[PDB]
Amino acid sequence: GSHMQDPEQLKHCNGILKELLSKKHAAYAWPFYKPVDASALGLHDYHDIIKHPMDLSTVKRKMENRDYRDAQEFAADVRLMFSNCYKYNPPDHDVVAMARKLQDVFEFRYAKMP
Numbered sequence: 001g002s003h004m005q006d007p008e009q010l011k012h013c014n015g016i017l018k019e020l021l022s023k024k025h026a027a028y029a030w031p032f033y034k035p036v037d038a039s040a041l042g043l044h045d046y047h048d049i050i051k052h053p054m055d056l057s058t059v060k061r062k063m064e065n066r067d068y069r070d071a072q073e074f075a076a077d078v079r080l081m082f083s084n085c086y087k088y089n090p091p092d093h094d095v096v097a098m099a100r101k102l103q104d105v106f107e108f109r110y111a112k113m114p
């Protein structure tokens with residue numbers, strides 16, 4: 001059920017999303033800007049292992065289309081994106097190091113939900 005706080009909380013989520021996409025974090029956020037192109041990268045098992053792909057461009061489209069009804073739904077998608085990275089890649093892979101840094105940006109600001 002929708003709560004009167006949902007629009008304001010979604011604005012906070014949109015602000016986080018803008019930050020994740022901003023130049024400030026680009027050095028480690030860039031792998032997450034677009035869907036994993038498994039075939040281009042030679043990752044021919046990616047879609048057998050990752051059943052629910054997610055990335056920041058998809059989160060952005062869902063936010064712009066008013067798909068997310070509340071902050072929790074938004075956060076589940078952002079976390080899904082990171083979890084897919086941790087599931088597919090060895091934990092010492094550089095993309096995992098980048099995911100951990102971007103997730104730290106996300107979690108600390110999500111925790112500041114007004």
Ligand SMILES: Cn1c(=O)c2c(ncn2CC2OCCO2)n(C)c1=O
Pocket residue numbers: 026027030033
């Ligand atoms: C392959 N590769 C990128 O694609 C990239 C990048 N730094 C940023 N990006 C992403 C680019 O910025 C705007 C959206 O695409 N670097 C260092 C890189 O190696």
Ligand SMILES: Cn1c(=O)c2c(ncn2CC2OCCO2)n(C)c1=O
Pocket residue numbers: 031032036041043084085088089094095
């Ligand atoms: C999330 N994600 C990527 O974005 C990715 C990738 N393999 C390549 N890329 C694109 C870029 O190349 C070097 C760092 O990320 N994998 C396995 C992955 O999980």
